[PDB]
């Protein structure tokens, strides 16, 4: 139910941005941001790269539904990465404090 | 049964510091460091923000019990971030060498 | 089906060969490579250290087996960390991208 999302983004202004608006919200508990990723993506059969950073979010399958309809209104890019990874198991009190602040 | 952990640290001390005490205690055959993140989080429903660095810990579902025992010990704050990701499958060359060095 | 998986290498040279080839060759959608890494093993019942970098791959468990292949062909290394990791659910429409760009 605990997921692990990650979301990529153009700039850290928009990384900062998604990450507050997502925690303010409680649409997830915890964000991090990783800066300096380099990506490598198909696009119209051609092979084009971008400079990004990486939004590591904790939250809720619960959350989810909510928190996609947000980050695709605050990205700028129509198709917005976001994919979530099951938490199979955890530091039982962080997973509730998780949970518990998360709606 | 193999698993991803994930887990934040306030400074590059205590990445290490965890980081060879896992691998060192077989909790864990690989740790990979990722420095310079930021961190936003709800904390008494008031968003703040850290610097922190990634731990993302190579190791089994067998070993977790065990593994955040000694984190909880060598983490300086009271609920530290740990949490698993199931690996669905891999190398399997590189699955028997974490299992095979982990216990 | 859609998987998230993991691969560290020595340097942003083969970093950037192996997101290419992967993308390249449709075994991936999408491939970010995130620079920095210290990583902190076993190895003949020593603790050692490296300097690494991480790839983050989208891709499918259909083309996990040919990815595997040509990860170890173009990875120097003989026995490389590829870990795939379950994506549970994320944005619908960039979910069908990564499988309609992925064979
Ligand atoms: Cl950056
Ligand atoms: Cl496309
Ligand atoms: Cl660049
Ligand atoms: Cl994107
Ligand atoms: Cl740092
Ligand atoms: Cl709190
Ligand atoms: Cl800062
Ligand atoms: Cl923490
Ligand atoms: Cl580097
Ligand atoms: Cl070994
Ligand atoms: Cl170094
Ligand atoms: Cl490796
Ligand atoms: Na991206
Ligand atoms: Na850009
Ligand atoms: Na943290
Ligand atoms: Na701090
Ligand atoms: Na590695
Ligand atoms: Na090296």
Same mark, same amino acid.
């Not at 139910?1 to 997502?22: F, G, N, W, Y």
């Given at each position: 139910?605990?997921?692990?999302?990650?979301?990529?983004?153009?700039?850290?202004?928009?990384?900062?941005? @998604?990450?507050?608006?997502?925690?303010?919200?409680?649409?997830?508990?915890?964000?991090? @941001?990783?800066?300096?990723?380099?990506?490598?993506?198909?696009?119209?059969?051609?092979?084009?790269?971008?400079?990004?950073?990486?939004?590591?979010?904790?939250?809720?399958?619960?959350?989810?539904?909510?928190?996609?309809?947000?980050?695709?209104?605050?990205?700028?890019?129509?198709?917005?990465?976001?994919?979530?990874?099951?938490?199979?198991?955890?530091?039982?009190?962080?997973?509730?404090?998780?949970?518990?602040?998360?709606?």
């Amino acid at each position: 139910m605990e997921e692990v999302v990650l979301i990529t983004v153009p700039s850290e202004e928009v990384a900062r941005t @998604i990450a507050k608006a997502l925690v303010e919200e409680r649409l997830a508990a915890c964000v991090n @941001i990783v800066p300096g990723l380099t990506s490598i993506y198909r696009w119209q059969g051609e092979v084009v790269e971008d400079q990004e950073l990486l939004l590591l979010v904790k939250t809720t399958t619960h959350a989810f539904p909510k928190l996609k309809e947000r980050v695709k209104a605050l990205h700028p890019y129509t198709v917005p990465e976001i994919v979530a990874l099951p938490i199979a198991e955890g530091n039982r009190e962080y997973l509730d404090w998780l949970r518990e602040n998360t709606g």
